[PDB]
Amino acid sequence: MKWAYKEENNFEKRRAEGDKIRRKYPDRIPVIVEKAPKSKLHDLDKKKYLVPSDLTVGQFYFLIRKRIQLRPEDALFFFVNNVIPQTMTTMGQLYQDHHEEDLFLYIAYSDESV
Template sequence: VVQVICEKAGRSDIPDIDKKKYLVPADLTVGQFVYVIRKRIKVSPEKAIFIFINNVLPPTAALMSNIYKEQKDSDGFLYVTYSGENTFGE
């Protein structure tokens, strides 16, 4: 199981998520996790959503467990930022 903290990008116009902490199955792909996030923020199907890990857009086929191993924080959590735009920050 992967421990994930999910937060909205500062300047994004996408809705806030109702829950920030997730326990994600290790074999879940990034794409499947994005689907989970979409459901939680109730975004319309035509609205794009992007997730960033350390300011990088991860490959959708990557396993969350592999991303976790490579990118987890020293506190044991994987920090994920989501946005309605394909650019981080600005």
């Protein structure tokens, strides 16, 4: 998978905003959300999210569902390093275990489970 946020912003600029957010906004998690390729869902205009660390993955599912006009009756899976996070996990625990060298957390969503 290729991320549009990396194709539009190099590491030096991504890292700079990451160091910036991590210092000035310590209780916030910089998350990059992008649709996985070969998926038939709606694409999100807003890719950069500044969610609080107390926010849970279940709550993040709800926020993303409202922006693609998807109902709970539809399939929606989050992937981080090809691993589906649990709903109880906080976005802060996701960041600590899964953030990249640019200090951003990358989440992909799809309608498939693979």
